[PDB]
Design a protein around this ligand. Structure first.
Ligand SMILES: COc1ccc(NC(=O)Nc2cccs2)cn1
Length: 163
């Protein structure tokens, strides 16, 4: 079974009227939920406006994020994977032979790409062996950076969030 941390979505922006039960009924549409909690004040029991769900598999997490925007009890919520919410990554170790279509063909299966920037030397124009990819949405980056490995154009690349 995949580590539970990778099966969790933190849900921000909840309606204060959302409950464990109503959050579960909503998010069960996209997979089996092993956990579903609305965070509440320990004294007043008033909702703190966020919670989390835990799916049985990572593919269910994917399915849930692909079904965004989620309107839950009348309010659009903000689901994010557990870990810095950015849309850009640094891709290192691609050397001089890696081109734009290599990066695009690989990274477009993580999300919609808006910019690919292959870095070149300011003086010579030679490729410097790293690039930046900007996506239209943060979940692409979140999926990317929790992988142990990235292989592009035969290279094992180092990939991290970029600000
Ligand atoms: C380790 O990642 C975490 C851990 C705790 C948290 N707490 C939160 O407030 N969760 C969120 C609400 C909406 C989106 S993120 C977030 N991310």
């Amino acid at each position: 079974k995949e580590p539970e941390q990778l099966r969790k979505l933190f849900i921000g922006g909840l309606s204060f009227e959302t409950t464990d039960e109503s959050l579960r009924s909503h998010f069960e549409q996209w997979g089996t939920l092993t956990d579903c909690v609305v965070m509440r004040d320990p004294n007043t029991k008033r909702s703190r406006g966020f919670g989390f769900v835990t799916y049985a598999t990572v593919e269910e997490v994917d399915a849930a994020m692909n079904a965004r925007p989620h309107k839950v009890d009348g309010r659009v919520v903000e689901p994010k994977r557990a870990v810095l919410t950015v849309k850009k990554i640094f891709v290192g170790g691609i050397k001089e032979d890696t081109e734009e279509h290599h990066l695009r063909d690989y990274f477009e299966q993580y999300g919609k790409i808006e910019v690919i920037e292959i870095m070149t030397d300011r003086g010579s124009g030679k490729k410097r062996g790293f690039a930046f990819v900007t996506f239209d949405d943060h979940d692409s980056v979140d999926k990317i950076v929790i992988q142990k490995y990235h292989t592009v154009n035969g290279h094992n690349c180092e990939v991290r969030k970029a600000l």
